[PDB]
């Protein structure tokens, strides 16, 4: 094997000169020396876990988005690993195909402005949302961002509809937003949401309902 | 004294016994394995104990002779032929490895008298150990190509 790969393991209770002779690294006569005592036992003083107050909650309704910086995109472009004349919109699916966004995507991607100062690509971008700064940068570039909504299943479909096609000769259509918060978000102009930038039917319907 | 099963006493059990099916299996990154395979092949080639056999796929400079084919295949006569070949090539006692594109049954039959020193392996099941072990390897061209494709690089 390569130098530095392997060591000899320590052999206990095998004669004195070895170094780990009779007591074999345990010392003398304790509970530790024979019986098992949980490593993190505190002696009976209230433990670090039991002392402090328990805090917060886990928002299960939460959906953490994968972050993706403009800088990375720019780098990719520079490299020439970014092929977007065929598909004018760089959607999440497209990103994943490229490598752009790697690993699994559960909820969606948020675009973030890390290298906004050095970003200059007149491109149509789609993602689950983007920071204000990023959006501004994109607009400066002469690009076009819109923020879309995808439910898990919908997102999955988007990412690779090929699989869906293979399975049941069809792709599942995109769900509307239903959570009020989500709806609100997509309505918002500053967030650059797909409800107002595309002028969706849902919003209109809601308005009608409100009226009557 | 307790029960008579203590490992302290001659008739008793064994301390820290190993139990039924022991699992010694380990992992290796696929890429690393591929690299190793490639390395083995390279070593073999350097030795000059790599011999490739083939014909149908590539244009031949010299024309394939009669009474002999490129399939890696053959009292039964085949066995005799094999023996003759061995005699010719000074590789009687040494171990050899035939890496084959498909189950050349005839070849295997011919070789089985010399089973102790002869490995005959299907393409997909060839092992690094088997190559390394073998004093001389005989591989089909197609098989070789397949192997290369498998352990490419990308």
């Amino acid at each position: 094997p390569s130098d530095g790969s392997t060591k000899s393991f320590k052999r206990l209770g095998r004669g004195p000169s070895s170094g780990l002779g009779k007591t074999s690294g345990r010392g003398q006569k304790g509970q530790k020396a024979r019986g098992k005592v949980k490593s993190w036992f505190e002696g009976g003083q209230t433990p670090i876990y039991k002392l402090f107050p328990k805090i917060g909650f886990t928002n299960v309704g939460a959906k953490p988005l994968k972050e993706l910086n403009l800088k990375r995109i720019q780098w990719f472009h520079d490299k020439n690993r970014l092929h977007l004349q065929p598909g004018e919109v760089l959607d999440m699916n497209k990103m994943r195909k490229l490598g752009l966004v790697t690993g699994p995507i559960k909820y969606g991607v948020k675009i973030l402005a890390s290298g906004k100062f050095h970003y200059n690509l007149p491109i149509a971008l789609e993602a689950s949302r983007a920071s204000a700064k990023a959006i501004a940068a994109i607009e400066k570039a002469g690009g076009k961002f819109t923020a879309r909504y995808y439910t898990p299943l919908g997102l999955r479909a988007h990412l690779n509809p090929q699989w869906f096609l293979e399975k049941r000769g069809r792709v599942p259509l995109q769900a509307r937003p239903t959570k009020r918060r989500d709806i609100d978000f997509y309505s918002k102009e500053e967030k650059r949401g797909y409800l107002v930038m595309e002028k969706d039917k849902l919003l209109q319907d809601i308005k009608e309902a409100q009226n009557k | 004294v307790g029960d008579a099963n203590s490992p302290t006493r001659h008739n008793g059990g064994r301390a820290l016994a190993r139990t039924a099916p022991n699992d010694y299996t380990t992992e290796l990154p696929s890429k690393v394995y591929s690299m190793a395979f490639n390395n083995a092949l390279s070593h073999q080639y350097k030795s000059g104990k790599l011999f490739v056999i083939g014909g149908e796929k590539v244009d031949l400079i010299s024309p394939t002779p009669e009474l002999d084919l490129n399939r890696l295949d053959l009292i039964f006569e085949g066995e005799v032929i094999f023996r003759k070949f061995l005699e010719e090539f000074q590789l009687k006692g040494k171990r050899l490895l035939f890496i084959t594109d498909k189950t050349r049954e005839g070849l295997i039959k011919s070789s089985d008298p010399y089973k102790q020193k002869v490995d005959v392996i299907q393409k997909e099941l060839v092992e690094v150990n088997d190559i390394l072990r073998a004093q001389a390897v005989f591989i089909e061209l197609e098989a070789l190509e397949y192997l290369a494709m498998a352990h490419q690089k990308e």
């Binding site: 993190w40 670090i48 876990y49 002392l51 805090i55 917060g56 | -």
Partner: protein
Amino acid sequence: LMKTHKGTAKRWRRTGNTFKRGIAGRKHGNIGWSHRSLKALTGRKIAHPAYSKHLKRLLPYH
């Protein structure tokens, strides 16, 4: 397999390398004490090195 100590999880939360926790001592018996003094007993606090090992063992997946 090995599992998180849920109590510890509830108390502690992972921030980069270390863990954060709520200060103890603020639940009651607060009156009469100066509110400027009690400001210190609010807020989070970072794990002392002494006990980091223990924390790590407690919550192996954080």
